[PDB]
Design a protein around this ligand. Structure first.
Ligand code: HEM
Length: 152
C-alpha cells in the first residue's frame, strides 16, 4: 500500500490537476494517442482525428478528458479503499471497451509525462514516487479484475 505521507503527496499533486481538469485530461489523451496510435482505434468517436491539431481542437476530446480524470480523481481520493469505484471501470474496460492492461500502463506513463510537462520543477522526486505508486495500485487492482474475467 501507500503510506499516509505518500497519499498526502498524491492528493497534493492532484490539486494541480483540479485547477485545470479539462486541460490536463486533454493532454493525457493526446499523449496516449500520439505515442500509441493503436489506442486511438479503441475510440469510435476519436478515430476520425487524423492529426494532433485536430485532437487539440476537439472539444469532445476535452470533454472526455474531463470524464476520465474526474473518475480517476474520485478513485485516488479513496486512498486504496476504492473497490466499489474501481470494479465497474475494470469491468467496462475489459468487457465493453476491450482495453488491454498494457494500455493502462501507457496512460499511467502519460499522466506522469503530462504532470512534468505542465509543472516543470514543481513535481519533485518524492511526488513522482507517490503518484507512480498510486497509479500502479490502480493498474494492479484493475489487472486483478481482468484476470477474474480472463480478459487479455
Ligand atoms: C486512468 C485510466 C482510465 C480511466 C479513469 C478511465 C475512465 C473512463 C470512464 C469514466 C469512461 C466512461 C464510462 C465507462 O465506459 O466506463 C470511459 C470510457 C471509455 N474508455 Fe477509459 N479510462 C481509463 C483508461 C482507458 C484507456 C487506457 C483506454 C484505452 C484506449 C480507455 C478507453 C475507453 C473507451 C474506448 C471508452 C468509451 C468512450 C466512449 O465512446 O464514450 N480508457 N473511461
Amino acid at each position: 500500500g501507500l503510506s499516509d505521507g505518500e497519499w498526502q503527496q498524491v492528493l497534493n499533486v492532484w490539486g494541480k490537476v483540479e485547477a485545470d481538469i479539462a486541460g490536463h485530461g486533454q493532454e493525457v489523451l493526446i499523449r496516449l494517442f500520439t505515442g500509441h496510435p493503436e489506442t486511438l482505434e479503441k475510440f469510435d468517436k476519436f478515430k476520425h482525428l487524423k492529426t494532433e491539431a485536430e485532437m487539440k481542437a476537439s472539444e469532445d476530446l476535452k470533454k472526455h478528458g474531463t470524464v476520465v480524470l474526474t473518475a480517476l480523481g474520485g478513485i485516488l481520493k479513496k486512498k486504496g479503499h476504492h473497490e466499489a469505484e474501481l470494479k465497474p471501470l475494470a469491468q467496462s474496460h475489459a468487457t465493453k471497451h476491450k482495453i488491454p492492461i498494457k494500455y493502462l500502463e501507457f496512460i499511467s506513463d502519460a499522466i506522469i509525462h503530462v504532470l512534468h510537462s505542465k509543472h516543470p520543477g514543481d513535481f519533485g522526486a518524492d511526488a513522482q514516487g507517490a503518484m507512480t505508486k498510486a497509479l500502479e495500485l490502480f493498474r494492479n487492482d484493475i489487472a486483478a479484475k481482468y484476470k477474474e474475467l480472463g480478459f487479455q
